[PDB]
């Protein structure tokens with residue numbers, strides 16, 4: 001008895017990357033579902049007993065330690081931001097991906113504007129170079145796909161002043177991804193906001209877009225020094241680390257806990 | 265030369281709880297402002313050199329360790345939630361405090377609905393009792409006040425099954441606030457959502473509302489076991505810990521870093 005698409009979809013939800021269970025074997029659907037369900041219950045019992053940290057939270061904490069230890073100031077800035085920030089980033093009506101809140105606000109689609117404000121303000125107080133980073137939620141309307149979430153988690157680190165070269169930027173990215181054990185290559189790309197970017201690729205998967213300033217947009221933000229920065233999606237890092245087939249396994253969600261289906 | 269309200273407001277921004285500087289001394293405004301500015305620059309230089317962690321982020325990590333170590337599963341759930349969750353929590357049109365996103369969504373004003381879903385789902389897999397917690401942003405339209413933010417950070421921990429008594433709930437709260445070094449008392453109050461609550465008070469400041477279930481709302485969420493839970497505002501905990509006069513010092517913001525004005 002062949003499997004329906006609904007049945008295939010259910011078994012894929014319950015299947016984990018570490019499993020070696022074939023759906024196209026001729027085993028009956030209810031027997032495959034029940035076996036997968038029992039393994040996932042066991043996986044959750046082991047997490048609860050020994051490993052009670054959330055993957056996204058744990059990765060945020062790991063990344064935070066890495067950048068604090070390397071001299072970067074940890075920033076926590078608003079997620080609900082002025083809609084005016086969007087036009088001032090030169091996002092001309094990505095502009096269609098913005099989640100609007102009431103009349104004058106939106107959910108941030110990137111961390112960059114808040115971090116530009118911090119760079120400008122902190123340069124009045126802190127010695128050269130200024131090094132800061134943030135990790136937190138960001139929001140984009142997206143087409144349903146294996147690599148995109150509408151609610152995702154960004155890391156953005158940046159530096160302003162001395163040391164703001166492509167060479168140093170690549171070196172930080174290398175040290176960062178070596179710490180996480182993720183292989184990568186850097187490929188040139190372009191962005192309608194920042195211009196030329198350095199894209200950090202794992203296979204076909206874009207982990208990060210990075211930028212070497214200065215750029216003309218800086219004057220709109222009161223920035224007048226060289227700078228570098230890079231933005232990474234944490235759920236994409238987790239997708240790589242755990243070999244997930246769909247980024248939803250990694251997302252904020254009532255539907256998966258650390259890649260294990262909660263629909264048991 | 266007396267100080268204007270604008271001048272007073274500027275000096276209050278630059279003043280920290282540890283300062284012993286009188287604005288009503290007769291010192292000229294520009295000399296007071298310049299002295300405060302120089303101390304705040306020094307405070308930020310010391311943070312950057314030695315103490316680069318954000319207060320909200322550091323407190324989230326401290327609380328996370330406390331509850332993981334006590335057997336609670338760390339949850340990270342969506343901040344952007346279905347508007348339908350609001351009516352199902354019996355919030356009948358707090359309903360006016362909700363930030364609406366597009367047509368069918370809103371920014372969560374509490375963590376409770378997501379955690380109720382997790383309790384129900386995890387009870388299919390995990391042994392008794394089920395203990396979970398979340399920390400993260402929540403959103404309420406509020407009047408401008410010393411104790412309220414429109415974007416704040418909630419902790420909610422909860423337990424379902426055995427051990428779900430007022431006695432155990434108070435004991436967890438006591439252990440938690442003793443760990444943070446915050447004195448408190450518990451006072452009865454009422455809530456249009458949950459019914460009777462136990463409110464955790466520091467002086468006149470409400471740190472938490474806690475609830476001993478079960479309650480009739482449980483049937484709407486598939487909950488049929490006893491439960492306990494409590495929700496705490498992290499920025500209010502930081503307000504207490506650091507003696508801030510206004511909770512904005514503690515908030516996600518481009519305007520303060522760890523209680524130090526960024527407008528220097």
Ligand SMILES: Nc1ncnc2c1ncn2[C@@H]1O[C@H](COP(=O)(O)OP(=O)(O)OP(=O)(O)O)[C@@H](O)[C@H]1O
Nearest residue numbers: 140142147148149152206207208209231232233236
């Ligand atoms: N919708 C999304 N879901 C999950 N992660 C995302 C999403 N959008 C961006 N990211 C992550 O944020 C990083 C920096 O954002 P950027 O603006 O470069 O994305 P992007 O170039 O639009 O990505 P893509 O081309 O894959 O849509 C990306 O490299 C990616 O890792």
Ligand SMILES: Nc1ncnc2c1ncn2[C@@H]1O[C@H](COP(=O)(O)OP(=O)(O)OP(=O)(O)O)[C@@H](O)[C@H]1O
Nearest residue numbers: 404406411412413416470471472473495496497500
């Ligand atoms: N607008 C806010 N800003 C900061 N913290 C908040 C806010 N609303 C609630 N909290 C925190 O969340 C906890 C639990 O939420 P709850 O629904 O009990 O708040 P509340 O009873 O409406 O508080 P209040 O009466 O002070 O408005 C509160 O005890 C408080 O510590």
Ligand SMILES: N[C@@H](CCCCNC(=O)OCc1ccccc1)C(=O)O
Nearest residue numbers: 110112115116158209218221229231
């Ligand atoms: N490449 C990432 C973001 C890189 C930016 C790094 N940091 C930062 O935002 O400050 C610089 C800056 C100055 C003026 C105007 C905007 C920004 C992305 O595309 O999401």
Ligand SMILES: N[C@@H](CCCCNC(=O)OCc1ccccc1)C(=O)O
Nearest residue numbers: 374376379380422473482485493495
């Ligand atoms: N006192 C806190 C929240 C306490 C709730 C604890 N945990 C939880 O949400 O699950 C129980 C539950 C079951 C059915 C419907 C809603 C909730 C506040 O008022 O913000």
Ligand SMILES: [K+]
Nearest residue numbers: 017018019020
């Ligand atoms: K496999």
Ligand SMILES: [K+]
Nearest residue numbers: 149151251252
């Ligand atoms: K999500």
Ligand SMILES: [K+]
Nearest residue numbers: 281282283284
């Ligand atoms: K004082």
Ligand SMILES: [K+]
Nearest residue numbers: 413415515516
């Ligand atoms: K805020």
Ligand SMILES: [Mg+2]
Nearest residue numbers: 094140142148
């Ligand atoms: Mg994109």
Ligand SMILES: [Mg+2]
Nearest residue numbers: 189199206209
């Ligand atoms: Mg791209």
Ligand SMILES: [Mg+2]
Nearest residue numbers: 199206208209
């Ligand atoms: Mg990109």
Ligand SMILES: [Mg+2]
Nearest residue numbers: 358404406412
């Ligand atoms: Mg209230």
Ligand SMILES: [Mg+2]
Nearest residue numbers: 453463470473
């Ligand atoms: Mg109250």
Ligand SMILES: [Mg+2]
Nearest residue numbers: 463470472473
């Ligand atoms: Mg309350």
